[PDB]
Write a protein that binds this ligand. Structure first.
Ligand SMILES: CCCCCCCCCCCCCCCCCC(=O)OC[C@H](CO[C@@H]1O[C@H](CO[C@H]2O[C@H](CO)[C@H](O)[C@H](O)[C@H]2O)[C@H](O)[C@H](O)[C@H]1O)OC(=O)CCCCCCCCCCCCCCCCC
Ligand code: CLA
Ligand code: CLA
Ligand code: CLA
Ligand SMILES: C=Cc1c(C)c2cc3nc(c4c5[nH]c(cc6nc(cc1[nH]2)C(C)=C6CC)c(C)c5C(=O)[C@@H]4C(=O)OC)[C@@H](CCC(=O)OC/C=C(\C)CCC[C@H](C)CCC[C@H](C)CCCC(C)C)[C@@H]3C
Ligand SMILES: CCCCCCCCCCCCCCCCCC(=O)OC[C@H](CO[C@@H]1O[C@H](CO)[C@H](O)[C@H](O)[C@H]1O)OC(=O)CCCCCCCCCCCCCCCCC
Ligand SMILES: CCCCCCCCCCCCCCCC(=O)OC[C@H](CO[C@@H]1O[C@H](CS(=O)(=O)O)[C@@H](O)[C@H](O)[C@H]1O)OC(=O)CCCCCCCCCCCCCCC
Ligand SMILES: CCCCCCCCCCCCCCCC(=O)OC[C@H](COP(=O)(O)OC[C@@H](O)CO)OC(=O)CCCCCCCCCCCCCCC
Ligand SMILES: CC1=C(/C=C/C(C)=C/C=C/C(C)=C/C=C/C=C(C)/C=C/C=C(C)/C=C/C2=C(C)CCCC2(C)C)C(C)(C)CCC1
Ligand SMILES: CC1=C(/C=C/C(C)=C/C=C/C(C)=C/C=C/C=C(C)/C=C/C=C(C)/C=C/C2=C(C)CCCC2(C)C)C(C)(C)CCC1
Ligand SMILES: CCCCCCCS[C@@H]1O[C@H](CO)[C@@H](O)[C@H](O)[C@H]1O
Ligand SMILES: CCCCCCCS[C@@H]1O[C@H](CO)[C@@H](O)[C@H](O)[C@H]1O
Ligand SMILES: CCCCCCCS[C@@H]1O[C@H](CO)[C@@H](O)[C@H](O)[C@H]1O
Ligand code: OEX
Ligand SMILES: [Ca+2]
Ligand SMILES: [Cl-]
Ligand SMILES: [Cl-]
Ligand SMILES: [Fe+2]
Ligand SMILES: [Mg+2]
Lengths: 34, 38, 342, 36, 64, 172, 504, 34, 81, 30, 38, 33
């Protein structure tokens, strides 16, 4: 019935995709020692 | 496949608990390692 | 004529979940890049070579202390293009030299232009008057005067605000100590507009909510409203009598009331922008000459004006060496202004 | 030879009060800086 | 309306209110000049900014 | 103090003695009044944008509304149709009652927090202190913007009430 | 009735009274320039172009007359210091008079056009309605602008038939009005090359002539006419205001950074010349050249021109003023009388010490002296009880070379500290503070005031462009939105294309 | 640089896994819009 | 409505979660490894805890020239032994 | 002089309050 | 003479034209495929 | 106090000129029918 790949789909993923990558990067930083 | 299977309240609850896990990890980091003043 | 231009126009203006429009071609990349630059920089990029500061999650900063900091003072007002003569196409050097700051500020400026064009574009399609775009001129005047005009009057981008929470706090305190910015009547008008706008927001919201007509039976009054109803949902007449008897005056024209709510914060922000334009040139409201002449000659004359300058003098001497490292200030202990004991 | 474009001008009483309040308050604000 | 000698002389210069060229007319040519003008402004901006450095162009009072 | 420059003196010494800028309740207060001013201009511009044409161009549009009239003076559906497209449909209000409740709630809650900031820093529970929080591998202090704020605060601290302290700590 | 903020809209459909209003505005602006020039001439002191130039005296329009070649007075002086000159009619006084006479002629013209407003020329020959063919008017006016632009560059600036323009050396010591040849190479786009100013006006004038002919002969495309509302005079106001604030930002920038059209002898030094010790480096280079060539310290410094030393003084930095510190710079630090000479500080060991100069940011600044390597060797302490670097402890003395104190040395701590306080401002001068009752607080120069007014006006005109642009594009809803707006036009989905009823 | 491959590899495998699960409907969406 | 599929529809659909139970952790882990391998330091030029200073120096490696700034940083980086 | 000026301006505002409250345009319902 | 910065200027010009070109290429394409029904 | 004495006439015209403008407009509005 509905399409899958729309403008809304692109807008959602240009934000959500880097967010998750960054959250994993920042989670790793909590274990860095000097 | 067909939207409806997994109830929304369980989705909300699982997503909420993931947020709390990741934010708690960040507050843990304020007291350990870099930026902890130690 | 149904050429490619008109077909493109058709597609840009489709009623989708996120309207795009012609304005969207400018708005969306510039907004996305300014935001992604701020997140990239506050997560991974240092300020060690420009400021002597750590400024990223990678280095151990938290949400309050991360920033994308301004370039080094030695860059002057350079655009700091990635392909320009300073970074020479080297992405890593560009980051170390402060290229993300101009990247964010310039894409941000054009993003703001794009948003205001979006307000015009949507308003013209839906058929409303473009007062939302007009009101948005105030945030644009603020952004342009503080992040562009102000450093352009100063020695370099270094003295622009850095993009961070605590970095902005340092900017507030720098403006007190060096510019005596609280004394400036253009800032005072801005404060009046912001606090008066917050006042109008609270009072109009509360007044509507407490002069509602009983249009339903439930104790939750939100349900008793229909977007297409023709009647006012609250009593302008009762509201008018309440404030006339509480305060002396009240609104009686609902069109004037809502124009005023546009007018007050928008004018306030515009006034503050003018004052910052003056500070670009150090054209400050720093002193009252009459007070200084009296105080120089009469060592018993003291006011809250003279008390505040002593504070400004403390700010300047105690923060300048660290805040302006390129100047190489060495202030021995014995020259630092200090009161008794402290 | 009457010009057809003329139009009467109005200022109602509330606008007078609002205007006088703006001018007086602006004067109260800027006077100190004028005397300096 | 009142006629004057000078008004009669200038009459042709205010007689074509509303006259347009069909369609897009010269718009594409206009766009080309706009683009060249944008690049011109970019050049003179970046020279003044010392982002574009050219041989023998010294952006300083020392150029007298 | 009960005066304009006295207010500034109060604010500056407050920052030196409590680091109020780094206190989340002052930050919530700033969100309250910045947001209150934003939503004020927002509500004013949307209602003004959707006024129903009742006047000619030579007269104030304000004469299109009459005190006590039964019918609304603007088209909230058109306003919601504009603002829903500006962002997305579900970020826009179409219930005037909950819209006005939001205009009431946001600045009032923010200013409550601001008030509670001043009231709890009255008992010296101060803003976040990240002075020397970042340390390198050897133990050198790496300055952050927090340490630059601290430098400014020290200047305020050492100069305020310059003849009033005989002992090294300004405990009240 | 009309609200007060709209009274002037009665001219929108009345071209003759629009012309009258525009004539009255032009008369007021011309009268202002005449009366400002007369006021400046009644207060200007011409007797010292070295230490009391026009920019120290609050002169605002005098530099604009001088820039284009008006340099003399009918009373016999010129701004470059000459006496006994004959400027002809085009003195400062003759220019002011010409603007006053023009003001009165434009006033008379305005009355004629106000009374005789109903001229057949303003009526469309087909409909008889008032109408202005703006596209063709633009080409006529652009054509006239191009001719004028071209003749300004080709004849006035070149000296072919005209005086030229003010030009100077890189240090603002020997300025004068000179014929300037165009620069046709890439250095013509260097803001400091006066030759590019000539070339710009010749080339842009020719382009304007050509573009003017195009806009006279070629009608607007229907698609641009509709989109920009070229029948609505308010569209011209919107784009005209945008061009004007663009221009205003540019002249504010070139005033602040400097260029060949904002010389320092007319408007004063820039802030950046203090930031980079521009004049101090030239002073040192000349002293090195003398010392290297066998001269003594006293000969080397005495050879420094007073005018050059005066540039190396923070009191002439336009970033040292204040918004409500009014008047000429002379009202602050005083009327400069003489260079005192170059102060040299030495400690008891005979090492030379250098006072750290005041950065423009600081209203006040501590007094700190270092050696050549930047090591702190002396200061004026705040707390005395743990001072180690006091002038008393370190045996600091000052000797003067050049200027009026040439050859003198002072050793008493109070006098040495006095000169060290002055030395944070750069070179040290004697000022007459009594004549104007100067208060000792720095003011900005005309460079500062010009920049501030034009940046502020530019920003405000941005709002004017937005407002009048909005009125042009939304004229149809200026009084409110359609009372019969269908909910379906504003609800989602009913139309595929927003606002397009043919796409249900 | 091997760290570049170590980092992109979890992303690349995610791209391919979503393509397996969506390609029947993706081709079906592209076909309908033709 | 604007025609796209409701969000509540999508995120309660098994197929959504089959896809995103992989794509979300895969991205998270890629972000973790960007830091854990030390690659983030080298992409952006950010000092590690042991590279802010040389062992005995206490001066900041501050950039002081506009057009030789790139070389200045490289020189500071060499002097870390 | 400056004290007189400040107090005079202030006094006018208090007078303005009185007229704006007690000699306002009456709101009239229709 | 082609200085390094004049070269850099051309690279910035080519980059921006490329970015603008692909953007409008993709947009014109998609607008031709998914037309509105009238 | 050594205030700037032009401050007096500056403040007085600042109040008077625009206030008088408003009064003229108001009074000629009342006198209309
Ligand atoms: C409203 C809505 C708008 C919406 C947003 C629009 C966003 C558009 C983005 C545009 C960004 C413009 C970047 C301007 C950079 C700049 O200016 O960079 C500045 C350069 C000049 O460079 C500076 O020049 C200074 C002076 O040097 C000169 O003097 C020196 C010392 O004596 C030496 O002699 C030196 O050789 C000589 O060049 C110093 O060298 C500085 O370090 C150096 O940065 O000018 C230049 O590029 C060009 C200068 C001429 C044009 C300026 C007009 C535009 C800016 C108006 C703002 C007015 C600000 C004044 C204060 C108020
Ligand atoms: C679409 C909107 C948009 C806008 C308005 C901008 C604007 C800007 N970008 Mg951004 N950018 C964008 C999208 C956009 N960008 C995208 C999608 C990306 C990802 C690739 C980037 C990635 C990016 C980086 C990495 C950088 C910028 C930078 C900039 C700034 C300088 C740009 C410049 O000088 O180009 C000049 C180019 C043009 C004006 C193109 C015009 C071409 C004309 C009209 C046609 C004629 C050209 C001709 C055909 C070619 C002749 C060449 C020949 C002679 C050799 C400017 C603020 C720089 C910056 O921010 O500095 C700090 C910078 O370093 N951008
Ligand atoms: C482009 C405009 C411009 C500039 C840059 C200058 C520059 C200068 N003038 Mg000139 N002047 C001008 C136009 C200008 N003038 C005009 C139009 C007149 C006729 C009135 C004059 C008449 C004049 C005289 C009689 C004198 C000067 C003098 C000077 C010099 C000192 C200026 C000074 O102290 O200002 C001080 C500036 C201020 C204190 C700024 C005022 C800020 C205003 C009041 C803010 C108002 C805010 C508003 C109320 C808020 C509205 C809010 C609302 C919208 C919500 C300086 C070189 C003096 C001089 O030295 O001559 C040799 C001098 O005696 N000028
Ligand atoms: C070339 C410039 C120009 C011209 C020919 C016009 C013309 C017009 N404007 Mg626009 N406007 C301009 C620039 C211009 N404007 C700028 C820069 C701004 C931003 C500040 C505006 C913002 C603006 C708004 C918000 C409105 C207009 C309106 C109008 C119309 C009615 C004006 C009126 O009756 O005022 C009457 C004004 C008075 C009786 C007194 C005003 C006193 C001012 C505030 C202080 C005194 C200024 C001083 C005397 C002169 C200083 C000159 C300065 C340049 C140095 C008229 C078509 C109105 C309109 O659209 O009607 C439908 C309207 O609402 N204009
Ligand atoms: C700090 C205070 C403040 C913030 C954060 C703010 C934010 C916003 N205002 C908006 C609107 C408005 N604000 C308005 C009046 C006001 N707004 C005010 C003050 C603010 N307004 C005030 C005081 C007023 C009274 C005049 C109006 C009338 C509107 C709107 O109509 C509009 C809206 O839709 O609101 C619902 C929205 C514009 C969205 C956008 O442009 O996307 C595009 C995003 C772009 C272009 C990126 C911009 C990048 C910026 C400029 C630089 C980079 C910033 C970094 C990414 C983050 C740095 C963070 C650190 C500093 C901590 C956005 C929510
Ligand atoms: C018709 C109306 C006329 C009066 C209207 C109301 C007047 C209000 C006063 C406004 C100016 C106040 C001047 C300061 C007090 C004073 O006495 O100054 C007095 C000064 C004169 O300066 C005097 O000069 C003397 C020797 O010439 C002595 O040195 C005196 O000490 C010195 O005070 O007035 C000026 O010169 C200012 C003239 C105009 C300069 C404007 C430049 C900047 C303009 C940009 C502003 C844009 C802001 C837009 C914001 C929106
Ligand atoms: C790094 C710099 C790069 C420079 C720029 C390069 C990229 C260009 C930038 C802009 C890209 C925008 C792409 C989004 C368009 C899209 O996803 O439509 C998706 C379309 C339409 O989907 C359809 O979705 C439609 C609704 S809607 O338009 O998506 O709202 C629906 O009508 C239709 O039935 C359905 O099939 O399908 C396509 O295959 C697009 C082909 C791309 C070629
Ligand atoms: C319930 C907890 C609320 C705690 C704070 C109070 C918020 C509401 C008070 C604002 C007063 C404004 C002026 C009066 C405005 C006014 O007159 O209100 C009117 C409005 C509607 O009134 P009704 O009569 O319809 O309903 C209220 C009762 O009669 C019960 O039906 O009241 C409400 O909506 C109450 C909502 C309660 C639930 C709100 C919960 C909000 C919590 C959100 C989390 C905030 C945390 C932020 C952390 C940063
Ligand atoms: C710069 C640059 C660029 C770009 C980049 C980008 C575009 C990026 C993006 C990025 C991104 C896009 C990122 C993101 C991130 C995100 C994040 C990091 C988030 C986080 C969040 C959180 C943490 C949350 C929290 C919270 C809140 C806030 C509230 C609610 C609750 C909670 C708690 C949840 C380019 C390449 C072009 C070029 C070069 C330069
Ligand atoms: C009739 C006649 C005549 C005469 C003429 C005359 C005598 C004229 C004069 C004229 C004049 C004598 C004019 C003047 C003018 C002026 C003006 C027009 C001014 C204005 C001003 C302003 C506008 C200002 C403003 C301001 C202020 C006040 C404050 C600060 C800010 C500002 C700047 C804004 C003759 C014999 C020739 C012959 C023919 C007939
Ligand atoms: C920049 C955009 C200017 C429009 S350009 C215009 O576009 C039409 C498509 O409708 C073509 O048919 C026509 O030939 C072309 O001149
Ligand atoms: C309308 C009355 C104006 C009269 C002005 C006549 C001045 S005319 C002026 O007079 C100067 C005398 O020193 C000469 O230097 C100059 O050559 C001459 O043009
Ligand atoms: C102790 C006072 C005498 C020592 C010399 C003081 C520095 S010099 C002194 O500075 C004054 C401004 O303060 C000028 O007005 C004056 O012209 C100048 O001689
Ligand atoms: O009193 Mn007012 O200020 Ca609260 O600290 Mn302690 O005390 Mn005083 O010192 Mn800091
Ligand atoms: Ca270790
Ligand atoms: Cl105090
Ligand atoms: Cl004590
Ligand atoms: Fe409302
Ligand atoms: Mg940690």
């Amino acid at each position: 019935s509905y399409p899958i790949f729309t403008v809304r789909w692109v807008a959602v993923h240009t934000l959500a995709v880097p967010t998750i990558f960054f959250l994993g990067a920042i989670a790793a930083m909590q274990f860095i020692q000097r | 496949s067909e939207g409806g299977r997994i109830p929304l309240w369980i989705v909300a609850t699982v997503a909420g608990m993931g947020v709390i896990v990741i934010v708690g990890l960040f507050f843990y980091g304020a007291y350990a390692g870099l930026g902890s003043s130690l | 004529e149904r050429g490619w231009f008109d077909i493109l126009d058709d597609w840009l203006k489709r009623d989708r979940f996120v309207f795009v429009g012609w304005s969207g071609i400018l708005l969306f990349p510039c907004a996305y890049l300014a935001l992604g630059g701020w997140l990239t920089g506050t997560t991974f990029v240092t300020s060690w070579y420009t400021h002597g500061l750590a400024s990223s999650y990678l280095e151990g900063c938290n949400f309050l202390t991360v920033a994308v900091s301004t370039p080094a003072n030695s860059m002057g007002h350079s655009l700091l293009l990635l392909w320009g003569p300073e970074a020479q196409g080297d992405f890593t050097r560009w980051c170390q030299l402060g290229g993300l700051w101009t990247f964010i500020a310039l894409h941000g400026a054009f993003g703001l232009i794009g948003f205001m064009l979006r307000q015009f574009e949507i308003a013209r399609l839906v058929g409303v008057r473009p007062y939302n775009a007009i009101a948005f001129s105030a945030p644009i005047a603020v952004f342009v005067s503080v992040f562009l005009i102000y450093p352009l009057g100063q020695s370099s981008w270094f003295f622009a605000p850095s993009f961070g929470v605590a970095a902005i706090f340092r900017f507030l305190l720098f403006f007190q100590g060096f510019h005596n910015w609280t004394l400036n009547p253009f800032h005072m008008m801005g404060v009046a507009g912001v606090l008066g706008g917050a006042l109008l927001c609270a009072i109009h919201g509360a007044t509507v909510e407490n002069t509602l007509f009983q249009d339903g039976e439930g104790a939750s009054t939100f349900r008793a409203f229909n977007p297409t109803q023709a009647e006012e949902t609250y009593s302008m007449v009762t509201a008018n009598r309440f404030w006339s008897q509480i305060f002396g005056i009240a609104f009686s024209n609902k069109r004037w009331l809502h124009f005023f709510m546009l007018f007050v914060p928008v004018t306030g922000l515009w006034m503050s922008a003018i004052g910052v334009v003056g500070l670009a040139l150090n054209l400050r409201s720093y002193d009252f000459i009459s007070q200084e002449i009296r105080a120089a000659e009469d060592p018993e004359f003291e006011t809250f004006y003279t008390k505040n300058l002593l504070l400004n003098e403390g700010i300047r001497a105690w923060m300048a060496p660290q805040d302006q490292p390129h100047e190489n200030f060495v202030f021995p202990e014995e020259v630092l202004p200090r009161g008794n004991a402290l | 030879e009457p010009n057809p474009n003329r139009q009467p001008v109005e200022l109602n009483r509330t606008s007078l009060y609002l205007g006088l309040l703006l001018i007086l308050v602006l004067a109260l604000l800027f006077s100190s800086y004028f005397f300096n | 309306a009142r006629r004057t000698w000078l008004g009669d002389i200038l009459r042709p210069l205010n007689s074509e209110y509303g006259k347009v060229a069909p369609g897009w007319g010269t718009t594409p040519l206009m766009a080309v000049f706009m683009g060249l003008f944008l690049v011109f402004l970019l050049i003179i901006l970046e020279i003044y900014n010392s982002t574009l450095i050219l041989d023998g162009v010294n952006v300083s009072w020392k150029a007298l | 103090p009960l005066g304009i420059s006295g207010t500034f003196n109060f604010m500056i010494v407050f920052q030196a003695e409590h680091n109020i800028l780094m206190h989340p309740f002052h930050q919530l207060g700033v969100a309250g009044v910045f947001g209150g001013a934003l939503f004020c201009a927002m509500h004013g511009s949307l209602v003004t944008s959707s006024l129903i044409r009742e006047t000619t161009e030579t007269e104030s549009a304000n004469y299109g509304y009459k005190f006590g009239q039964e019918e609304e003076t603007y088209n909230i559906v058109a306003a919601h149709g504009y603002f829903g497209r500006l962002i997305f449909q579900y970020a826009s209000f179409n219930n005037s009652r909950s819209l006005h409740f939001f205009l009431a709630a946001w600045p009032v809650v923010g200013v409550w927090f601001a008030a509670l900031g001043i009231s709890t820093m009255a008992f010296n529970l101060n803003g976040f202190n990240f002075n020397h929080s970042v340390i390198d591998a050897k133990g050198n202090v790496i300055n952050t913007w927090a340490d630059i704020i601290n430098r400014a605060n020290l200047g305020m601290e050492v100069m305020h009430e310059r003849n009033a302290h005989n002992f090294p700590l300004d405990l009240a | 009735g009309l609200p007060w903020y709209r009274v002037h809209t009665v001219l929108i459909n009345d071209p003759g009274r629009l012309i009258a209003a525009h004539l009255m505005h032009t008369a007021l602006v011309a009268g202002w320039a005449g009366s400002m020039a007369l006021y400046e001439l009644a207060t200007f002191d011409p007797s010292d172009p070295v230490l009391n130039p026009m920019w120290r005296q609050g002169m605002f329009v005098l530099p604009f007359m001088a820039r284009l070649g008006v340099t003399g007075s009918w009373s016999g002086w010129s701004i470059t210091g000459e006496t006994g000159i004959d400027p002809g009619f085009w003195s400062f006084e003759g220019v002011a008079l010409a603007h006053i006479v023009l003001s009165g002629l434009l006033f008379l013209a305005a009355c004629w056009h106000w009374v005789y407003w109903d001229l057949e020329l303003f009526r469309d020959p087909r409909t008889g309605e008032p109408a202005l063919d703006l596209p063709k008017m633009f080409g006529i006016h652009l054509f006239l602008a191009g001719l004028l632009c071209f003749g300004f560059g080709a004849f006035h600036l070149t000296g072919l038939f005209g005086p030229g323009m003010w030009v100077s050396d890189p240090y603002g010591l020997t300025g004068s009005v000179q014929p300037v040849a165009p620069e046709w190479g890439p250095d013509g786009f260097n803001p400091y090359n006066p030759g590019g100013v000539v070339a710009h006006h010749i080339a842009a004038g020719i382009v304007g002539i050509i573009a003017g002919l195009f806009h006279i002969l070629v009608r607007p495309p229907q698609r641009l006419y509709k989109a920009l509302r070229m029948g609505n005079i308010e569209t011209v106001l919107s784009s005209s205001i945008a061009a004007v604030f663009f221009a205003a930002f540019v002249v504010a920038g070139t005033m602040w950074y400097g260029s060949a059209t904002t010389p320092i002898e007319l408007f004063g030094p820039t802030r950046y010349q203090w930031d980079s010790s521009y004049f101090q480096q030239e002073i040192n280079r000349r002293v090195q050249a003398s010392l290297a060539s066998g001269a003594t310290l006293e000969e080397a410094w005495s050879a420094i021109p007073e005018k050059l030393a005066f540039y190396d003084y923070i009191g002439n930095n336009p970033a040292k003023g204040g918004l409500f510190r009014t008047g000429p710079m002379n009202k602050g630090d005083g009327i400069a009388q003489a260079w005192k000479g170059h102060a040299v500080f030495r400690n008891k060991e005979g090492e030379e010490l250098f006072v750290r100069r005041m950065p423009a940011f600081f209203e006040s600044f501590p007094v700190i002296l270092t050696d050549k390597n930047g090591v702190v060797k002396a200061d004026i302490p705040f707390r005395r009880a743990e001072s180690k670097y006091s002038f008393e402890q370190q045996g600091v003395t000052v000797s003067f070379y050049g200027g009026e104190l040439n050859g003198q040395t002072f050793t008493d701590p109070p006098t040495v500290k006095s000169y060290a306080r002055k030395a944070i401002f750069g070179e040290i001068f004697e000022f007459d503070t009594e004549t104007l009752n100067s208060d000792g607080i720095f003011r900005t120069s005309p460079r500062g005031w010009f920049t501030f007014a034009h940046a502020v006006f530019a920003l405000l005109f941005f709002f004017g462009h937005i407002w009048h642009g909005a009125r042009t594009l939304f004229r149809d809803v200026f009084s409110g939105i359609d009372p019969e707006l269908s909910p379906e036009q504003v609800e989602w989905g009913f139309y595929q294309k927003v606002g397009d009823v043919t796409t249900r | 640089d091997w760290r570049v491959l170590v980092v992109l590899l979890p992303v690349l495998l995610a791209a391919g896994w979503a393509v397996r699960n969506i390609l029947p409907y993706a081709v079906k969406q592209v076909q309908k819009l033709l | 409505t604007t025609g796209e599929r409701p969000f509540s529809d999508i995120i309660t659909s098994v197929r959504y979660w089959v896809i995103h139970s992989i794509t979300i952790p895969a991205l998270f882990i890629a972000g973790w490894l960007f830091v854990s391998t030390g690659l983030a330091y080298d992409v952006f030029g950010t000092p590690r805890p042991d590279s802010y200073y040389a062992q005995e120096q206490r001066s900041i490696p501050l950039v002081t020239d506009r057009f030789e700034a790139k070389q200045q940083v490289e020189t500071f980086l060499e002097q870390l032994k | 002089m400056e004290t007189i000026t400040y107090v005079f301006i202030f006094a006018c505002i208090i007078a303005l309050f009185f007229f704006a409250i007690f000699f306002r345009e009456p709101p009239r319902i229709t | 003479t082609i200085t390094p910065s004049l070269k850099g200027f051309f690279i910035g010009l080519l980059s921006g034209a490329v970015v603008l070109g692909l953007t409008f290429a993709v947009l014109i394409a998609i607008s031709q495929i998914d037309k509105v029904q009238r | 106090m050594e205030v700037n004495q032009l401050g007096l006439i500056a403040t007085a015209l600042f109040v008077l000129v625009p206030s008088v403008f408003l009064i003229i407009l108001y009074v000629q509005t009342e006198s209309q029918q």
